[PDB]
Amino acid sequence: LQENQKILAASFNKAMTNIVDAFTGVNDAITQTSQALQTVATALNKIQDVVNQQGNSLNHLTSQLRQNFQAISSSIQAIYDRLDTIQSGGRGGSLDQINVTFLDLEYEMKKLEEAIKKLEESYIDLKELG
Amino acid sequence: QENQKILAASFNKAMTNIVDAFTGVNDAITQTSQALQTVATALNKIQDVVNQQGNSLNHLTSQLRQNFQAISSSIQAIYDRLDTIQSGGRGGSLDQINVTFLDLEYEMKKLEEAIKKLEESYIDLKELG
Amino acid sequence: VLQENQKILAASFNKAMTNIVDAFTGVNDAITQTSQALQTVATALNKIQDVVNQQGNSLNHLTSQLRQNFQAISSSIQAIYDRLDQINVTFLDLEYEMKKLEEAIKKLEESYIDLKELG
Ligand SMILES: [Cl-]
Ligand SMILES: [Cl-]
Structure with missing residues (x-):
């Protein structure tokens, strides 16, 4: 039974490392989406x-x-x-x-800036997680 | 037995944090969608x-x-x-x-389609936690 | 008693993993659609x-x-x-804006979750 517990603990720790990697990707996506939207704002x-x-x-x-x-x-x-x-x-x-x-475009530029800001508040705290 | 309860505690802690992280994801989807809809109006x-x-x-x-x-x-x-x-x-x-x-009719149609599919991607938080 | 609790723990982990991979699958679709939306905006601009x-x-x-x-x-x-x-x-x-927008789109598409590694 001791062995079985070692195995589950091994699975849990491996899964967390992958889940942290996944959420790191998600933070990159948020950053890049934000940058893209800021560039669109400028164009507008x-x-x-x-x-x-x-x-x-x-x-x-x-x-x-x-x-x-x-x-x-x-x-x-x-x-x-x-x-x-x-x-x-x-x-x-x-x-x-x-x-x-x-x-x-006053209303639209304002809402766009607002969504950009709130998007940037969605970042996962990876240090807490992993 | 001791080793088991520390493990169950780790799992519960991880789940709490994972659900929180996915909540952030859902907010990000919402704000991305809002931003794109605002861009659509501007166009x-x-x-x-x-x-x-x-x-x-x-x-x-x-x-x-x-x-x-x-x-x-x-x-x-x-x-x-x-x-x-x-x-x-x-x-x-x-x-x-x-x-x-x-x-821009073709572009407006594609943008709408992409926004709707984006909004299909929300994480079911209740299922998860 | 002890084995019973261990089975429940293994079951909780597998169920959570199943749900987590499904959730990240959604995340990947969101990335795809955000990329599509931005490419469409680009064409419009x-x-x-x-x-x-x-x-x-x-x-x-x-x-x-x-x-x-x-x-x-x-x-x-x-x-x-x-x-x-x-x-x-x-x-x-808009040449500078189009260049930066293309850069953000490419890098966004570098953020896909490797579902196979996770699953
Ligand atoms: Cl996103
Ligand atoms: Cl887990």
């Missing part, structure tokens, strides 16, 4: 920056265009007034609003 | 804004083309009235702009 | 960059044509009268 911030920049450029361009056409139309009409013509000199002078939208 | 919003901006751009160029045509016609009519060899027909056109759109 | 940079190019090409049309129109008007801003398009470059 960079996307918003460029997308919002492009929206601002579009808005500013449209504003300038509207002024250009207004000035041009004013000039053309004044020329027409001088020429005594029945033809219309008041076309091409205006620009409709084009509905430029913007990206705000 | 959807990015697509909406990118496609809106492509529509705004097409809509702008469309109006611009009409404005340049009307302006060019007026200038040509003035040149015709003035009896001039100088060209009144320049600045009247816009070349095609080539606006493209984003379609 | 590449497609976003493509469409964003194309739209930036279109905007530049447009602005270029516009400056020329306005110069021509301005010349025409001035000639009739005689007879009588920089748009900063930025571009998205």
Whole structure:
């Protein structure tokens, strides 16, 4: 019976070493998942920056265009007034609003940072275990 | 008998710690899943804004083309009235702009499938302890 | 008495081992699916960059044509009268992020539990 107890003790100790190895892997997975998610966060911030920049450029361009056409139309009409013509000199002078939208990922970036933090609180305490 | 009770004690201690470690795993699965779902929403919003901006751009160029045509016609009519060899027909056109759109439908489907399978992987803590 | 307790201990150990290998099997599936999810996000980010940079190019090409049309129109008007801003398009470059993301995915896939060693 003494032998049998030595065997069970041998099994238990071998199993623990493997279980510690397994949980070490798990900690590596958590670390790498966290890193990956942090990289995705960065990419998302960079996307918003460029997308919002492009929206601002579009808005500013449209504003300038509207002024250009207004000035041009004013000039053309004044020329027409001088020429005594029945033809219309008041076309091409205006620009409709084009509905430029913007990206705000504030809520999403915040939740993503939050999950990253809580993920990093999931690490197994291996020293306690093994 | 003495050796047995120390062994049973080791086993119970190990089980407590193992169940605790798997609890950490389940939390990690939950937070990974939450993170991916949040990324999914961000991707959807990015697509909406990118496609809106492509529509705004097409809509702008469309109006611009009409404005340049009307302006060019007026200038040509003035040149015709003035009896001039100088060209009144320049600045009247816009070349095609080539606006493209984003379609993440396939990616969104695969991401959802991966999130659902992730959430099938929880450890049954009650079975274990 | 003593043998009876020893059988219960062996039984407890085997049952726990069975449950532990099943649990780590789940862990491996979680690793697989997290990896898949991240590769899918990666593809999405590449497609976003493509469409964003194309739209930036279109905007530049447009602005270029516009400056020329306005110069021509301005010349025409001035000639009739005689007879009588920089748009900063930025571009998205995720190359560093894509490289780090790929590194994390590869290393995550190096964390699989060896179920055979455990079992
Ligand atoms: Cl994970
Ligand atoms: Cl055990």
